[model samples]
Target: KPVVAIVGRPNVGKSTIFNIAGERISRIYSSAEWLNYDFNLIDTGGPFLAQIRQQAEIAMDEADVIIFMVNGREGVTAADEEVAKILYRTKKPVVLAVNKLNIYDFYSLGFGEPYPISGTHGLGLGDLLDAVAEHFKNIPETKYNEEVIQFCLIGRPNVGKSSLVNAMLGEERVIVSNDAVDTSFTYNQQEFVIVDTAGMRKKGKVYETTEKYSVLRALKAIDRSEVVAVVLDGEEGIIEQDKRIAGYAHEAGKAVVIVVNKWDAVDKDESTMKEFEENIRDHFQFLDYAPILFMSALTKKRIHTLMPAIIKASENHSLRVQTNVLNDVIMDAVAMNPTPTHNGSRLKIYYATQVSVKPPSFVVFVNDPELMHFSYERFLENRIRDAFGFEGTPIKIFARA
Candidate 1:
């Protein structure tokens, strides 16, 4: 999928322009009619600082097309020139969107006509998107064979994720994308694409910062990926940032696998792995279904296990049970444990059906959705998991009366 980044100096209606463009872009790409025309929009937040520059640089590098939003009213400023210089260096597609000032020049910027737009009223957005869509056509799509599992290794900086990607770069590599993040390979007759999120970083920055910038990118990556291998720094142990990073994947309904990297560096006995797993479980209670693998990307200890685990998780993530079978499981569950009673009226679940996969979704028809308690819903979800074995995927259950 092509990545479109909306970038410019601070307070130039970048966010407003992005949100408007985002809705229209989403409308075009989301529908099945334009299934092959899918693209990602990067909302690089508004700011003009060294930190923001580093982020914009990352976006520019990762972006297939850059939406250079300039204020026609403000004309051009030093900050605008700064971003423009960076974009020029990238030599990527740049759609000059003149916001607020209504600059109607196709030759002023020397790229093309400036897209005169009103961020407040959402004018000239169609022309801007038209230009963006043209650029999307030129960028090649990430190709993969059928039944290929798309996975990404996502973690904070210096977590040995890049090391693991380097380790896997030998004979098995068949087709790789234009960027290091997307690599397609084959092993044991199975084709797989592994995205290395660690390559997303700051070069020539003042210093390092939070797991902040990558979260948005990681979120987009997670949505694209069938499986997300959330890497943890074994030497550093778990930190607050680690939990925050993994939460995005879990919340996005992507199949998750917890990878403990740098295991060789961690001083451990037999019980250390067990203790660490327990700690992770406690911290990320929502990701209890995520499988954990202990390995050192440096030493290649158990590195072979990563792909197999991803395949299994991807299968489970997209797995679906038959309607009758799913209903039977839920019915049997209710019979075994029973639902709660409210005001002398018991919660009556009429039927349950699995409506979707890729993070399975189930809709349960009940007598009263209001009467369905959270505990009982969780109980039913557990029952479904117990019966169907939805490992490494978060399942959603909705009640409708």
Candidate 2:
């Protein structure tokens, strides 16, 4: 979808504007006209804004229109003028939205000289929306091939997200450093906006902010993607934080794979490698589908392993059993150990069809979804395992009417 960027100084309602735009932007393409296209409303919101500068710039450049949201009462500042310069240089469609322009505060905005309103008080938002949508028609349609399964790398602060991205891109396109806030600013809008949380934690340690927000951004990208490659420290194994990050991806219904980076630091034998991987799965039972690969970002050891796994996992995730195939497989499965009669009713799976994938979902249309007990599901899982090898993966089954 066409991106709409709302840029302004702090306390100028950047968050409010983003909240409003984010609310409506997702619905734009659902109106029958733009349904066939992929539309996303994006911005580097809040303190997180500083890290994704380049990505944000590219987003603004790629945008159909850039929303130059200003506090009309406050007039303009150095930041506004700076952004105005970039928007002007792009020669792109830009709508100057003067926020907080009340009838009494009209002249103070000075927007009649440029544009005019307040971000807090809703005055000229209707015109803003109309102007924003008008630019959508001006830009050519965004198109990309869907055959490749997109992979997103996610982790906590300084877990080497930029390093991982640099490794993946195989270039300096992504900036990485031990310094604070510098790494995230470079990747902004250049190739893909790589997110960095260093800037948001200015007042505190980089690890102190909402773990939920970091996870939310990661999950949003993963949900929109086919697979997620989560980065972790080799020595740390599965920390409390790492488990939560994995949980967000799983709950988002995305296929997850773990990237154990900085492997060069650890000294391990073959047995140790096997045991460590197994130990992780034993603790985090829900992450049955996640595959872990050892790597040294500095040395590039097994860095190439991610893409291949992503592609294969995507193909497997998209597995669809035709109605005939599903019925045939399950019938044989049930025949081996016939359905047991429960309290007056026998637990029988009537039919099944793969409704979705990426978490490899299926809707098992049974006599009654309620009759499908948890233990019964395990039996069916065993049958499924024999029939189909969904190795090193998670299978999500849903019993439906």
Candidate 3:
């Protein structure tokens, strides 16, 4: 799907226009469809001028269509021109939109005729969407076969993520820096999109420090990927932020792999790798099912192991099982450990069936869903995991009466 970004100077009603266009509110990015064109909509409206510039640059670099929104009530300001200057550099299509009663001054900004729009009353949006959809007419949607595995590398800043990306691709694909943007590449017949996001700093500091920005960015990337490789800095060790990042992947129901990068820098004895694995397990107990791989992106040590892990995770992420086999596992689980009782009544599970894949969700028909305790559900999930090696993927078990 193509990406459409709404960007301009702050307080130009950019978010309002974005909310109207996307039919959603307060999201940094969202998947939307307009006139049969499914596209990702990104709102890059911020408070500061530097933030506006940064967001515009990101929009220019990432978006397929740029909606340059300007406040008609306040013509064009220096900040608007600043954003226009950056948008001028991008070859991608730019749709100039004049917000709040919408101007001829917009033409001076150097795009085509500006689409006048009222985000409040929802005026002239159809015309704007028609123009935006025009750009994607020639570009055919690229669909990958099921054999193709889509994965992304996500971690805190300076964790050798981009370096690991470069190492995996066997080329200097990503710029190794403390601050890096999202980049995608194809390696060895598999598609790898590495989202190297900036680290979140003190909460009340700056726009980048806003937890919403970082989480939304990672969430968008995690949504696109089947396998999310949570990279950790071996030298820096696991911090609260690392677990927070991994928790997002796990919660998002994507296959996860814990990557301890910069192993080359870590002073190690024979038991170093084992101790590091144990430390990671202790910190991220929720990710006990995820496989841990230690590799240095700088030296390319054990980098070859990364692909196989991702491939296996992706496989298990989409793995499906027959209903009979699934029920057998559930039955065996109940036989080993009887279901708990509530109010003098024991829980009875009728049957279990695989309802979906890509994290593999199952729905169990039970006498009463409330009777299925959390521990019993976990026990059933473990039995399913043991029967089917969902090593790097989180499986979901649902109870239905």
Candidate 4:
């Protein structure tokens, strides 16, 4: 999918325009479709002028088409000029848009005829989008084959996620700042697109609201990735924020790998790695299926181990089992331990079938779903895991009537 970024001065109605073009408003950015062209819509509007300029720079680097919005009512401003200067540096296509339906002077901005739009009234957007769509005509469609593995590195601020990315790609593809960025490279004949995201902050500060928005950004990254590597700072050890970040990946049902970065800086003995693993297991009990890797992004130590773990996790996440073999494992599980009794009625599982992959869900037809205890479901999931060797992926089992 192509990416479209909306860049403008504060209160130029960038968010409102984004909401009109896109579907959801819960996040700072949104995914939109115009004339059968689906693209990501990013709103890069902020209060600070410097931040606005920085955002436009990132948009220029990341987006295929840029929507340089200005207030038609205001004609032109110094802030707009500053942002324009940054946009001018990029050779990528920029679509100029004038908000508030009312400027002939916008020609001075030099992008071309500015499409006047009213974000509140929903007028003239189709024309603006038409102009945007014109640029996508020559750009080739982006399609990934089955061999491409999509993954993301998510962690709290300054855990060296970006450094890890630079090390893996063997180039500085991303900035060292706490940010969200995407880059792709091939390793061992497998294409990998790593969506490196912003550091999630602890909630309820002066910038608490922005913190939530940043987390939403990470969640969006999680949604697109087939495997999510929760990077941790080995020097700092685990914190409450780390657990919250890891929980999002688990809830999203993507394959997960726990990465302990900065291992070179850690003061360690022979038992240190084992103790740290145990501590992580205790804190992240829900992520028991996730494999842990200790490596240093700076020293490049043990970095070679990271890719194999991710590849294995991705394979297990999409693994499928034959029905006859699935039923055989289900039957053996039930025989070893009988189903629990509730209200003088014993739960009876009629049959089992694999429903889906990418976390490998199952539908077990039972006499009553309510009678299917959580422990029983867990036992069956474990049996399936033992049989299938889903090493680094979470499996789901649903009881259906």
Whole-model Cα lDDT per candidate?
A: 0.73, 0.59, 0.75, 0.77
Considering TM-score, which of the candidate structures 1 and 3 is the better prediction for this target? Answer: 1
After superposition, the stretches of candidate 2 with alpha carbons farther than 4 Å from their true spots are 1-145, 171-212, 391-393
Return the top candidate by TM-score: 1
TM-score ranking, best first: 1, 4, 3, 2
Over the stretch 152-211, how does candidate 3's per-residue lDDT look in tens digits?
787776677667766776744323222134444565545554544333222235544455
lDDT of 4 by residue, 75-118 (tens): 78988878876665554677888888635446445565678888
Who is ahead in TM-score, 3 or 4?
Answer: 4
lDDT of 2 at 224: 47
Supply candidate 2's per-residue lDDT for 212. 68
How does each model score on TM-score?
A: 0.62, 0.55, 0.59, 0.60
- Model 3 C-alpha RMSD vs. true structure (Å) is 17.5
Local error of candidate 4 at residue 388 (angstroms): 0.4
Which residue pairs collide, candidate 4? none
Q: In model 2, how large is the Cα lDDT of residue 191? A: 25
Better of 2 and 4 by lDDT: 4
lDDT: the better of candidates 1 and 2: 1
